[PDB]
Each structure stands twice: as C-alpha cells, then as structure tokens.
Amino acid sequence: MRFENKVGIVTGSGGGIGQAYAEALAREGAAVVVADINAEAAEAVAKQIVADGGTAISVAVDVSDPESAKAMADRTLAEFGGIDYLVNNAAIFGGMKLDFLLTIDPEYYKKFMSVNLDGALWCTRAVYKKMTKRGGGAIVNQSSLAKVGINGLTQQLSRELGGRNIRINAIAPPDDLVGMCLFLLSDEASWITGQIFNV
Amino acid sequence: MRFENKVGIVTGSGGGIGQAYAEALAREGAAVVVADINAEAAEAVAKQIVADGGTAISVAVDVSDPESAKAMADRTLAEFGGIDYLVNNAAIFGGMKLDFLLTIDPEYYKKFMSVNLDGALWCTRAVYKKMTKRGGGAIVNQSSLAKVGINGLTQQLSRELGGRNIRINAIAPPDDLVGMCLFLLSDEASWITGQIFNV
Amino acid sequence: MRFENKVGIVTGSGGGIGQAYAEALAREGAAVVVADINAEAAEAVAKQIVADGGTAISVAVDVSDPESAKAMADRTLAEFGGIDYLVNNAAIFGGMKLDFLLTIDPEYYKKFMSVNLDGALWCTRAVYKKMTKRGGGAIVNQSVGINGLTQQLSRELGGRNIRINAIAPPDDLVGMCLFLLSDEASWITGQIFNV
Amino acid sequence: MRFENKVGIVTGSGGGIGQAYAEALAREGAAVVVADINAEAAEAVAKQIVADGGTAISVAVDVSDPESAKAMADRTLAEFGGIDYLVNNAAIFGGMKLDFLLTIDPEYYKKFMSVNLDGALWCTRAVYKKMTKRGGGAIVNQSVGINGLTQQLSRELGGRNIRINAIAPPDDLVGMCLFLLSDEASWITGQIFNV
C-alpha cells in the first residue's frame, strides 16, 4: 500500500500495459484516473477496479489535444482533490503502416506522430502546476527511431520541472514493467529524474 | 551548366542557404521554382535570378500542409512541364524557444514540429510521380535530436522510391553546402541514395 | 549506517571522484578497498579513511591487466571475507592528445583504450563469482560504448542477483553512485544514468 | 579503365569481400597490393588477378601491428612507385563469442578489438604521407564507433586532398567502394555509407 491516499492518472489505460499500471496503482491504495481515447474500455477497467475494492474513475482523453489533457487534469482535481502521479502510456500502434509513408493517410500519420511524440508534453503541462501545489509529484513516460523524441523530451522536461519536487523519467521497452513503473513513481526513486530505462 | 533544361524546386528558398541553392541551380541552367512560406521574399529572389539571366518563378508554400505542397508541384508542372529535382530546405528556426516546452505556444510548437519533421514527406509525395514520368529524379533533405527523424525519413523514402530512378539523400549541418547539394542532385551521385551527409 | 557489514572495491580512488566514492562508502559503514595504479596515493587515501573512523585498505592494481584485477579481488576476499560492491572508476588522463590519432604513440593509445574501455570488464570478471557466493552484488561503471559493455554484462550476470549500471558524468555523483549500489536500486540493472 | 595508373592496397583480401574489392580494382586498371594476415591466400589471390590480366602482388600484414602496416606501405611504394588508395577490410572472425565477455580469452578479446577498430588507424597512418606526395588519395573503411574514427581521421587528414569514408555492410558493396575511391566522390569525406 505504497500509494495510499495518492492520486494517479494513467493515459492509454483502457487496455494493455496501461491497464496493468492503472490496476496496480489502485491495488496499492491510489485513486486512479483511467484515461483513454476509448471511453467504453476506460469505463470497463475503472468498473473492475472499483469492484475489486479500489478507487477509480474513467475519462476520455485525446492526448494530442492540449485542451482535452487539461480537461482530464481538471476532472481529476474535481474528483480526487489533487494529482500526485501521471503515467503517459497513451500511444498509436501503427506497425507496418509506417512502411508506406508515400501513400499513408495524412491525418493518420499526423495523429500518430502527435500522440506518440507530444502526448506526454500536453499531459505533463496539464498536471505539473497541480502537482507543485501537492508538494511534488512523479511522471513516467512510456516510449512506444523517434523514441529519441520521448528520451529528449524527458530530459528537457526534467530540467524545466526542477525546484518543484517533480521527477520525470522514461521507460523504453512482462509485469516487470509494472514493478519498474510504480518504483519510478515512489519516493524510493527520489534520486532519479531525467533518466531513460531500457526494459 | 550541369542542369540545362532541368527543373528544380527549392523550399525555404526566400533566404539563407535555400536562396543560395536556388540561385546556384539557375546559374547552371535549371528552371528553378523558388518556394517559401514568405511570398514577397520568394518573389524577390526569383526576380533577381531572372534579371541575372536565369529561369525562375516564386511560389508560396506551407510545407506542413500536403495540399499546399501539391499545389506547388502542379504549378511547377504548368510553368515548366516537369520536375527533376526537389530540395527540402524549408524549416522553422526556434532556437531558445524550445528550451521552454512547459510554456511554449502549442500552435507554434506543432507548426515547428510539422514543418521540420514532415515537410520533406509532403513535398516528396507531391513530386515523386511526376519525377517518375520524367524517367527519374533526385531529392535532397536538409536536416535542421529530432534530426534523426529526417535521417530515418530519408532512409525509408529511399527504399519506397526504389525502381523509379529517384534518389533521396540528407544533408545535416559555407558554399560547400551548395557544392554538396548540387552534386547530390547530379547524375554523378547515381550510386548515392538513402545516405546522410554530415557537413 | 547504510552500508554496514558490506565490502566495496573502488578503482581509481587515489584521487578525484574515485576518492570521493571510497570516502562516502566508508563513512556509511562499508569496508572499502582503495584500489589504484598509484600505490602511494591509494594508501594515503586508505590511511585518511581509517584516521577519520572508517575501515579501509589500499591495493595497487592495473585494471588493464586481468591478473592484476584478480589479485585485487583475492586480496579483498582475504582481508574482509567477501565482496559486495565494485565501482569501476580507474582511468588514464588522456584528453586533447586523442585529437592527434595520426601521431599519438601506439602503446599509449592502446593502454588508454584498455584502461578506459576494458578496465571495467576485467574487474567485473574478477569479482562476479565472489559476489555470487555472497548472494548478489552491485557494480557501478564510470563512463561512449562502455554503455554497451554495461548492457551486455548486465545480461551475462543474470540469475546471480548482481546489478551493473553506468554513470555518465560532485555530491550529485557520489549520491547517485551510492544509490545505485544500495538495495533501493534493486529494480535497476543494465542502465546508463546521466548526472 | 577507371583506375589506370593508380596504386591501391586492400587489407583482408585473402578472401571474402576483400578479395572482391582487390579483383575489381585490378580489372579496372589499378596496380593492387593484396594484403592479408594469411600470406598464402593473399598470394593465391594475387596470382589469379595476374592470371586474369591484372597487376597485383601479395604482402603479409598484421593490421594490429603499426610496424607491420608500415612495412606493407613501404613494399607498395618500392613495388609500384606510389600509393593512391587504401581499403581497410582486414578483420578477425569474432562472432557469437563476444556474447560471453565474462569468459572470453583476454588476449583474443584484445586482438579482436585491435584488428577491427585499430586496424584502419595503423594502416591509414602507414599510407597518408605517401598519398600526400602523390597529390592526394582515398581511403575506405569497412565497418560501430569505427564511424567516429573515420570522422576524426577525415578532419586530421585535411589539407592533403586525402578522403576517408566508411561502408557499413556484394556487387553493391564493390560498386560503392570503387565509387568512394574515384574522383567522382571528390565531395565526400568523413561520411558513413549504409549499403
């Protein structure tokens, strides 16, 4: 119960490893905001967390949209009174589509690049002043070439966030991830900010 | 006069090294399309090229917009009958603004990332079928972390463009650039595609 | 306090940040082997640690020689009964002379690369079986491709509860180094930290 | 045809792609020094080139030994009157054994790194003053950080009209290599090509 009475937001938590991050946080006492572009999936995971004796709500977010990220943060405040943690796991999985850049749909490509590269930026901007008001916080960026973008972003934000007691780190890739993520959120990772963990 | 009766497009050619690329091409006999987000600057450079005994027109392009790139290509066809070369030099110079990602204007950041990372993609898509119809062509991408994006893009496009006799290469940084750029466009660089030149 | 009953070796600790690591380990309770190519400087640093109320000895080592690294490890085991930690900080002061690869003395060039790239390898090889008998251990490499060495060794050391990480560079460094050796860093191996 | 009146050295040309480079250079008119640690294989390849109507000799060289690389260069100069080109392709067949850094034989490990990383350095040092007397030259390194070596050497070789580039890997390779040596590649130095 490391995270008792803490508040964490996990983007892309409607499924996959994001869901496991959300569930693990709630298992250890945190109020979790289950944020996903898919509302129904997010609500499904939140409902199971609550049925399991946890605290969670779901929220629809478009991580590529700064205002949708802001709304996610304001909802978390209204529902839980503060924000301690943010896990930027939301991503667009493209796979072989990006092998055909000459013919790929422009709007798909733009959304893919925007979510995967800037998603963590908009969500970080949406939470960091609220965290500061809590006395500090911790953020984890889940990376996915181009993953140097999130590595670069993580180093930059780590410096900009200095003096707020806010740490920010990146994980670059099976419940060893979960263990690593929650560790990077916890107070035992106090010496760690601006670092990239290869998993 | 290596480029006599050839047709080349240079984006970001309203000033700086792009202007020198445009002027050099026209000096060696090519019909040059002087493409820039700034119409007046582009027209100024085109007017001097014509006054110097060259062949050139100016065109306004937003390289982040696939349709503006298409319009640039169609104008070149209409004006000169074909497209042999494309120099992707258009870029947003941000400098110290990107040291303040927490507070940077979102629309500025999006435009900066879109022009610098995807500009070469949209312009390449706009010209490659027209080049194919010419019997081949050559493209140079001018890179500017994040410059791995244009390096990656250049390698990917090089493979996708195979079998069209179209070469594509990247330059990553003072008229040695000009020399290198025109060489990479010329037939003597036939062995070179998908490569990055550190200048 | 924090490293009570632990035994740590620090190479290149006859001066600079290596000395600082050794002194920090000893003040937090560890028995420390001050290892350096410079035997006098190492002994002087060991003597000051002991004069300041820590436990330490000195050992002369050439980290470019696998047999010298072994002897360093055997001495530690004989002196303190085990090995828990290794900090690979040994380094040759090669700098702007690597701008002249066309004229640099070959034997110096090789020695430079050997110490700075292979030093950590030979010392890790010297201690890893001893650490395995203790039930695990932690290694920190001071950094280049010595990051790749750290990733590779981390995979090779698996199943032994031995962690190995790198720091790419003062109290910031000392703090990070001790953290990476501590049980708090149990989730961390095969990583490179920029301090 | 294309390399008429030119003199080129290819290391590691007793087999593999090294042989292919040497044979391609000779069929295009160059006098070629087939250099290899394996003296018999080098001589056999030299003999076939000459039997096929090219000009070549063999020389035994250990590219890890700076003095052996010098002797290779002196022989070339004495035999053909100058040096224009060097292709650094010498390499030791080390593979999956580098997955066992904890147990790999130290002397093999060092030799492996010496040949594969330093081979190109010692050979470049052996030829660059000779190339300068000829009015320039071109060097190709078969690739890692040996890219950094190529960038560094390119800067150090400035003002001599000597170009040095790297290829990171069959007829594709041969073509690229000969192009990088030709006068057509005059705009290219300190670059790494992926073929």
PDB file of N, CA, C and O in Angstrom, chain B residues 28-84:
ATOM      1  N   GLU B  28      23.357  27.318 -63.206  1.00  0.00           N
ATOM      2  CA  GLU B  28      23.787  26.169 -64.011  1.00  0.00           C
ATOM      3  C   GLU B  28      22.705  25.653 -64.972  1.00  0.00           C
ATOM      4  O   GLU B  28      22.782  24.518 -65.446  1.00  0.00           O
ATOM      5  N   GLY B  29      21.703  26.489 -65.256  1.00  0.00           N
ATOM      6  CA  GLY B  29      20.788  26.259 -66.379  1.00  0.00           C
ATOM      7  C   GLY B  29      19.403  25.720 -66.062  1.00  0.00           C
ATOM      8  O   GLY B  29      18.557  25.638 -66.956  1.00  0.00           O
ATOM      9  N   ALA B  30      19.155  25.362 -64.804  1.00  0.00           N
ATOM     10  CA  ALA B  30      17.858  24.802 -64.410  1.00  0.00           C
ATOM     11  C   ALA B  30      16.778  25.875 -64.294  1.00  0.00           C
ATOM     12  O   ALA B  30      17.056  27.003 -63.881  1.00  0.00           O
ATOM     13  N   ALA B  31      15.549  25.518 -64.666  1.00  0.00           N
ATOM     14  CA  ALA B  31      14.377  26.311 -64.310  1.00  0.00           C
ATOM     15  C   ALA B  31      14.076  26.063 -62.831  1.00  0.00           C
ATOM     16  O   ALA B  31      13.793  24.933 -62.439  1.00  0.00           O
ATOM     17  N   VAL B  32      14.134  27.112 -62.014  1.00  0.00           N
ATOM     18  CA  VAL B  32      14.007  26.963 -60.560  1.00  0.00           C
ATOM     19  C   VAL B  32      12.686  27.520 -60.038  1.00  0.00           C
ATOM     20  O   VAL B  32      12.315  28.633 -60.372  1.00  0.00           O
ATOM     21  N   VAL B  33      11.987  26.734 -59.217  1.00  0.00           N
ATOM     22  CA  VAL B  33      10.805  27.213 -58.500  1.00  0.00           C
ATOM     23  C   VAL B  33      11.214  27.617 -57.083  1.00  0.00           C
ATOM     24  O   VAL B  33      11.625  26.778 -56.274  1.00  0.00           O
ATOM     25  N   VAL B  34      11.107  28.912 -56.800  1.00  0.00           N
ATOM     26  CA  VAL B  34      11.538  29.476 -55.535  1.00  0.00           C
ATOM     27  C   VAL B  34      10.362  29.442 -54.570  1.00  0.00           C
ATOM     28  O   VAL B  34       9.520  30.334 -54.580  1.00  0.00           O
ATOM     29  N   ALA B  35      10.312  28.397 -53.744  1.00  0.00           N
ATOM     30  CA  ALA B  35       9.172  28.142 -52.870  1.00  0.00           C
ATOM     31  C   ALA B  35       9.489  28.555 -51.440  1.00  0.00           C
ATOM     32  O   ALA B  35      10.497  28.132 -50.869  1.00  0.00           O
ATOM     33  N   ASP B  36       8.621  29.383 -50.864  1.00  0.00           N
ATOM     34  CA  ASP B  36       8.801  29.847 -49.496  1.00  0.00           C
ATOM     35  C   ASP B  36       7.449  30.166 -48.871  1.00  0.00           C
ATOM     36  O   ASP B  36       6.496  30.469 -49.581  1.00  0.00           O
ATOM     37  N   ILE B  37       7.374  30.082 -47.546  1.00  0.00           N
ATOM     38  CA  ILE B  37       6.175  30.481 -46.810  1.00  0.00           C
ATOM     39  C   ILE B  37       5.978  31.992 -46.956  1.00  0.00           C
ATOM     40  O   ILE B  37       4.848  32.483 -46.922  1.00  0.00           O
ATOM     41  N   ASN B  38       7.086  32.715 -47.127  1.00  0.00           N
ATOM     42  CA  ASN B  38       7.068  34.149 -47.401  1.00  0.00           C
ATOM     43  C   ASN B  38       7.048  34.425 -48.909  1.00  0.00           C
ATOM     44  O   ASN B  38       8.047  34.216 -49.598  1.00  0.00           O
ATOM     45  N   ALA B  39       5.912  34.914 -49.404  1.00  0.00           N
ATOM     46  CA  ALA B  39       5.716  35.150 -50.835  1.00  0.00           C
ATOM     47  C   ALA B  39       6.617  36.258 -51.379  1.00  0.00           C
ATOM     48  O   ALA B  39       7.218  36.107 -52.447  1.00  0.00           O
ATOM     49  N   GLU B  40       6.704  37.360 -50.641  1.00  0.00           N
ATOM     50  CA  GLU B  40       7.460  38.535 -51.075  1.00  0.00           C
ATOM     51  C   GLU B  40       8.958  38.246 -51.175  1.00  0.00           C
ATOM     52  O   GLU B  40       9.609  38.669 -52.129  1.00  0.00           O
ATOM     53  N   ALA B  41       9.497  37.525 -50.197  1.00  0.00           N
ATOM     54  CA  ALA B  41      10.908  37.138 -50.214  1.00  0.00           C
ATOM     55  C   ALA B  41      11.193  36.211 -51.391  1.00  0.00           C
ATOM     56  O   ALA B  41      12.179  36.395 -52.109  1.00  0.00           O
ATOM     57  N   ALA B  42      10.313  35.231 -51.588  1.00  0.00           N
ATOM     58  CA  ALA B  42      10.426  34.298 -52.709  1.00  0.00           C
ATOM     59  C   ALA B  42      10.379  35.025 -54.053  1.00  0.00           C
ATOM     60  O   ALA B  42      11.150  34.709 -54.958  1.00  0.00           O
ATOM     61  N   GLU B  43       9.478  35.995 -54.186  1.00  0.00           N
ATOM     62  CA  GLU B  43       9.382  36.769 -55.424  1.00  0.00           C
ATOM     63  C   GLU B  43      10.645  37.607 -55.647  1.00  0.00           C
ATOM     64  O   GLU B  43      11.141  37.695 -56.769  1.00  0.00           O
ATOM     65  N   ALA B  44      11.172  38.195 -54.575  1.00  0.00           N
ATOM     66  CA  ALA B  44      12.417  38.964 -54.652  1.00  0.00           C
ATOM     67  C   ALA B  44      13.590  38.132 -55.181  1.00  0.00           C
ATOM     68  O   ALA B  44      14.328  38.592 -56.047  1.00  0.00           O
ATOM     69  N   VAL B  45      13.756  36.911 -54.675  1.00  0.00           N
ATOM     70  CA  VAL B  45      14.849  36.039 -55.138  1.00  0.00           C
ATOM     71  C   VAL B  45      14.634  35.576 -56.582  1.00  0.00           C
ATOM     72  O   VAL B  45      15.578  35.560 -57.372  1.00  0.00           O
ATOM     73  N   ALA B  46      13.399  35.220 -56.924  1.00  0.00           N
ATOM     74  CA  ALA B  46      13.055  34.848 -58.299  1.00  0.00           C
ATOM     75  C   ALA B  46      13.322  35.981 -59.296  1.00  0.00           C
ATOM     76  O   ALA B  46      13.810  35.737 -60.401  1.00  0.00           O
ATOM     77  N   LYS B  47      12.993  37.211 -58.903  1.00  0.00           N
ATOM     78  CA  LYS B  47      13.174  38.378 -59.774  1.00  0.00           C
ATOM     79  C   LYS B  47      14.649  38.636 -60.083  1.00  0.00           C
ATOM     80  O   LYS B  47      14.997  38.965 -61.218  1.00  0.00           O
ATOM     81  N   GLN B  48      15.503  38.486 -59.071  1.00  0.00           N
ATOM     82  CA  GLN B  48      16.950  38.642 -59.239  1.00  0.00           C
ATOM     83  C   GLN B  48      17.539  37.529 -60.110  1.00  0.00           C
ATOM     84  O   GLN B  48      18.406  37.788 -60.942  1.00  0.00           O
ATOM     85  N   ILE B  49      17.069  36.298 -59.923  1.00  0.00           N
ATOM     86  CA  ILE B  49      17.509  35.180 -60.766  1.00  0.00           C
ATOM     87  C   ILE B  49      17.198  35.455 -62.241  1.00  0.00           C
ATOM     88  O   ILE B  49      18.052  35.252 -63.105  1.00  0.00           O
ATOM     89  N   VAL B  50      15.984  35.928 -62.515  1.00  0.00           N
ATOM     90  CA  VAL B  50      15.574  36.258 -63.882  1.00  0.00           C
ATOM     91  C   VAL B  50      16.386  37.431 -64.437  1.00  0.00           C
ATOM     92  O   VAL B  50      16.812  37.396 -65.590  1.00  0.00           O
ATOM     93  N   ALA B  51      16.612  38.453 -63.615  1.00  0.00           N
ATOM     94  CA  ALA B  51      17.441  39.597 -64.016  1.00  0.00           C
ATOM     95  C   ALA B  51      18.894  39.196 -64.293  1.00  0.00           C
ATOM     96  O   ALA B  51      19.591  39.869 -65.051  1.00  0.00           O
ATOM     97  N   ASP B  52      19.337  38.093 -63.693  1.00  0.00           N
ATOM     98  CA  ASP B  52      20.708  37.615 -63.861  1.00  0.00           C
ATOM     99  C   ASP B  52      20.854  36.679 -65.062  1.00  0.00           C
ATOM    100  O   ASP B  52      21.943  36.163 -65.310  1.00  0.00           O
ATOM    101  N   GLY B  53      19.765  36.465 -65.803  1.00  0.00           N
ATOM    102  CA  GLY B  53      19.777  35.610 -66.990  1.00  0.00           C
ATOM    103  C   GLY B  53      19.360  34.174 -66.713  1.00  0.00           C
ATOM    104  O   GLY B  53      19.640  33.273 -67.510  1.00  0.00           O
ATOM    105  N   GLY B  54      18.681  33.959 -65.589  1.00  0.00           N
ATOM    106  CA  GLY B  54      18.210  32.630 -65.213  1.00  0.00           C
ATOM    107  C   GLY B  54      16.739  32.436 -65.522  1.00  0.00           C
ATOM    108  O   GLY B  54      16.082  33.331 -66.053  1.00  0.00           O
ATOM    109  N   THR B  55      16.231  31.253 -65.194  1.00  0.00           N
ATOM    110  CA  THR B  55      14.814  30.950 -65.318  1.00  0.00           C
ATOM    111  C   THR B  55      14.286  30.593 -63.939  1.00  0.00           C
ATOM    112  O   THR B  55      14.753  29.635 -63.321  1.00  0.00           O
ATOM    113  N   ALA B  56      13.324  31.372 -63.449  1.00  0.00           N
ATOM    114  CA  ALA B  56      12.750  31.120 -62.134  1.00  0.00           C
ATOM    115  C   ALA B  56      11.381  31.754 -61.952  1.00  0.00           C
ATOM    116  O   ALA B  56      11.078  32.790 -62.542  1.00  0.00           O
ATOM    117  N   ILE B  57      10.554  31.101 -61.141  1.00  0.00           N
ATOM    118  CA  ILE B  57       9.347  31.709 -60.604  1.00  0.00           C
ATOM    119  C   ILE B  57       9.310  31.491 -59.097  1.00  0.00           C
ATOM    120  O   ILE B  57      10.037  30.656 -58.560  1.00  0.00           O
ATOM    121  N   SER B  58       8.459  32.254 -58.425  1.00  0.00           N
ATOM    122  CA  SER B  58       8.269  32.131 -56.995  1.00  0.00           C
ATOM    123  C   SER B  58       6.909  31.515 -56.726  1.00  0.00           C
ATOM    124  O   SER B  58       5.979  31.668 -57.520  1.00  0.00           O
ATOM    125  N   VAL B  59       6.799  30.808 -55.611  1.00  0.00           N
ATOM    126  CA  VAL B  59       5.513  30.273 -55.181  1.00  0.00           C
ATOM    127  C   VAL B  59       5.457  30.178 -53.659  1.00  0.00           C
ATOM    128  O   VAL B  59       6.448  29.836 -53.006  1.00  0.00           O
ATOM    129  N   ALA B  60       4.294  30.516 -53.110  1.00  0.00           N
ATOM    130  CA  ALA B  60       4.055  30.445 -51.680  1.00  0.00           C
ATOM    131  C   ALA B  60       3.657  29.024 -51.349  1.00  0.00           C
ATOM    132  O   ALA B  60       2.766  28.464 -51.990  1.00  0.00           O
ATOM    133  N   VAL B  61       4.329  28.428 -50.364  1.00  0.00           N
ATOM    134  CA  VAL B  61       4.004  27.076 -49.926  1.00  0.00           C
ATOM    135  C   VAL B  61       4.032  26.972 -48.415  1.00  0.00           C
ATOM    136  O   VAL B  61       4.929  27.515 -47.776  1.00  0.00           O
ATOM    137  N   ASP B  62       3.048  26.277 -47.854  1.00  0.00           N
ATOM    138  CA  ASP B  62       3.124  25.813 -46.471  1.00  0.00           C
ATOM    139  C   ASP B  62       3.452  24.326 -46.517  1.00  0.00           C
ATOM    140  O   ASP B  62       2.594  23.477 -46.742  1.00  0.00           O
ATOM    141  N   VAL B  63       4.722  24.039 -46.287  1.00  0.00           N
ATOM    142  CA  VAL B  63       5.273  22.698 -46.378  1.00  0.00           C
ATOM    143  C   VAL B  63       4.647  21.704 -45.378  1.00  0.00           C
ATOM    144  O   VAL B  63       4.704  20.491 -45.595  1.00  0.00           O
ATOM    145  N   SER B  64       4.036  22.215 -44.306  1.00  0.00           N
ATOM    146  CA  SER B  64       3.332  21.364 -43.339  1.00  0.00           C
ATOM    147  C   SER B  64       1.955  20.914 -43.836  1.00  0.00           C
ATOM    148  O   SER B  64       1.327  20.054 -43.226  1.00  0.00           O
ATOM    149  N   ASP B  65       1.498  21.499 -44.939  1.00  0.00           N
ATOM    150  CA  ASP B  65       0.179  21.242 -45.494  1.00  0.00           C
ATOM    151  C   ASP B  65       0.328  20.452 -46.802  1.00  0.00           C
ATOM    152  O   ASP B  65       0.834  20.988 -47.790  1.00  0.00           O
ATOM    153  N   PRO B  66      -0.110  19.177 -46.816  1.00  0.00           N
ATOM    154  CA  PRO B  66       0.024  18.327 -48.012  1.00  0.00           C
ATOM    155  C   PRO B  66      -0.571  18.919 -49.299  1.00  0.00           C
ATOM    156  O   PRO B  66      -0.048  18.672 -50.387  1.00  0.00           O
ATOM    157  N   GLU B  67      -1.653  19.685 -49.167  1.00  0.00           N
ATOM    158  CA  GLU B  67      -2.321  20.286 -50.315  1.00  0.00           C
ATOM    159  C   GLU B  67      -1.573  21.497 -50.856  1.00  0.00           C
ATOM    160  O   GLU B  67      -1.590  21.743 -52.058  1.00  0.00           O
ATOM    161  N   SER B  68      -0.938  22.261 -49.973  1.00  0.00           N
ATOM    162  CA  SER B  68      -0.090  23.372 -50.397  1.00  0.00           C
ATOM    163  C   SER B  68       1.161  22.860 -51.134  1.00  0.00           C
ATOM    164  O   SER B  68       1.632  23.495 -52.081  1.00  0.00           O
ATOM    165  N   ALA B  69       1.691  21.717 -50.693  1.00  0.00           N
ATOM    166  CA  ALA B  69       2.807  21.063 -51.383  1.00  0.00           C
ATOM    167  C   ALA B  69       2.370  20.573 -52.759  1.00  0.00           C
ATOM    168  O   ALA B  69       3.082  20.773 -53.742  1.00  0.00           O
ATOM    169  N   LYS B  70       1.197  19.941 -52.827  1.00  0.00           N
ATOM    170  CA  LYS B  70       0.629  19.503 -54.110  1.00  0.00           C
ATOM    171  C   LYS B  70       0.488  20.668 -55.092  1.00  0.00           C
ATOM    172  O   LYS B  70       0.881  20.552 -56.253  1.00  0.00           O
ATOM    173  N   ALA B  71      -0.072  21.779 -54.616  1.00  0.00           N
ATOM    174  CA  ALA B  71      -0.263  22.981 -55.438  1.00  0.00           C
ATOM    175  C   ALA B  71       1.068  23.523 -55.962  1.00  0.00           C
ATOM    176  O   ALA B  71       1.157  23.985 -57.101  1.00  0.00           O
ATOM    177  N   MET B  72       2.095  23.468 -55.122  1.00  0.00           N
ATOM    178  CA  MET B  72       3.451  23.838 -55.528  1.00  0.00           C
ATOM    179  C   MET B  72       3.928  22.969 -56.697  1.00  0.00           C
ATOM    180  O   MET B  72       4.459  23.480 -57.686  1.00  0.00           O
ATOM    181  N   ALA B  73       3.725  21.660 -56.578  1.00  0.00           N
ATOM    182  CA  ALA B  73       4.122  20.721 -57.626  1.00  0.00           C
ATOM    183  C   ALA B  73       3.349  20.959 -58.932  1.00  0.00           C
ATOM    184  O   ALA B  73       3.945  21.003 -60.004  1.00  0.00           O
ATOM    185  N   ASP B  74       2.033  21.133 -58.832  1.00  0.00           N
ATOM    186  CA  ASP B  74       1.185  21.368 -60.013  1.00  0.00           C
ATOM    187  C   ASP B  74       1.530  22.679 -60.729  1.00  0.00           C
ATOM    188  O   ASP B  74       1.465  22.754 -61.955  1.00  0.00           O
ATOM    189  N   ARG B  75       1.888  23.702 -59.959  1.00  0.00           N
ATOM    190  CA  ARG B  75       2.353  24.973 -60.515  1.00  0.00           C
ATOM    191  C   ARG B  75       3.647  24.787 -61.298  1.00  0.00           C
ATOM    192  O   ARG B  75       3.814  25.360 -62.373  1.00  0.00           O
ATOM    193  N   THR B  76       4.564  23.996 -60.749  1.00  0.00           N
ATOM    194  CA  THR B  76       5.832  23.708 -61.413  1.00  0.00           C
ATOM    195  C   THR B  76       5.600  22.993 -62.742  1.00  0.00           C
ATOM    196  O   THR B  76       6.219  23.342 -63.741  1.00  0.00           O
ATOM    197  N   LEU B  77       4.712  21.995 -62.746  1.00  0.00           N
ATOM    198  CA  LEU B  77       4.319  21.311 -63.986  1.00  0.00           C
ATOM    199  C   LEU B  77       3.793  22.288 -65.018  1.00  0.00           C
ATOM    200  O   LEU B  77       4.251  22.301 -66.156  1.00  0.00           O
ATOM    201  N   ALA B  78       2.814  23.088 -64.610  1.00  0.00           N
ATOM    202  CA  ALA B  78       2.153  24.032 -65.500  1.00  0.00           C
ATOM    203  C   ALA B  78       3.141  25.041 -66.073  1.00  0.00           C
ATOM    204  O   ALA B  78       3.055  25.405 -67.248  1.00  0.00           O
ATOM    205  N   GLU B  79       4.085  25.477 -65.247  1.00  0.00           N
ATOM    206  CA  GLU B  79       5.040  26.510 -65.643  1.00  0.00           C
ATOM    207  C   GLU B  79       6.219  25.961 -66.451  1.00  0.00           C
ATOM    208  O   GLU B  79       6.683  26.613 -67.382  1.00  0.00           O
ATOM    209  N   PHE B  80       6.703  24.774 -66.098  1.00  0.00           N
ATOM    210  CA  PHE B  80       7.937  24.252 -66.694  1.00  0.00           C
ATOM    211  C   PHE B  80       7.837  22.873 -67.346  1.00  0.00           C
ATOM    212  O   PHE B  80       8.816  22.409 -67.936  1.00  0.00           O
ATOM    213  N   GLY B  81       6.676  22.226 -67.247  1.00  0.00           N
ATOM    214  CA  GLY B  81       6.423  20.968 -67.953  1.00  0.00           C
ATOM    215  C   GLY B  81       6.877  19.687 -67.267  1.00  0.00           C
ATOM    216  O   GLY B  81       6.603  18.594 -67.761  1.00  0.00           O
ATOM    217  N   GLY B  82       7.559  19.799 -66.132  1.00  0.00           N
ATOM    218  CA  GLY B  82       8.047  18.612 -65.422  1.00  0.00           C
ATOM    219  C   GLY B  82       8.805  18.975 -64.165  1.00  0.00           C
ATOM    220  O   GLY B  82       8.997  20.160 -63.880  1.00  0.00           O
ATOM    221  N   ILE B  83       9.234  17.956 -63.414  1.00  0.00           N
ATOM    222  CA  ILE B  83      10.004  18.151 -62.176  1.00  0.00           C
ATOM    223  C   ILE B  83      11.129  17.127 -62.112  1.00  0.00           C
ATOM    224  O   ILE B  83      10.866  15.924 -62.121  1.00  0.00           O
ATOM    225  N   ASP B  84      12.369  17.606 -62.042  1.00  0.00           N
ATOM    226  CA  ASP B  84      13.539  16.738 -61.942  1.00  0.00           C
ATOM    227  C   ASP B  84      14.090  16.668 -60.518  1.00  0.00           C
ATOM    228  O   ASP B  84      14.519  15.599 -60.069  1.00  0.00           O
TER     229      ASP B  84
END
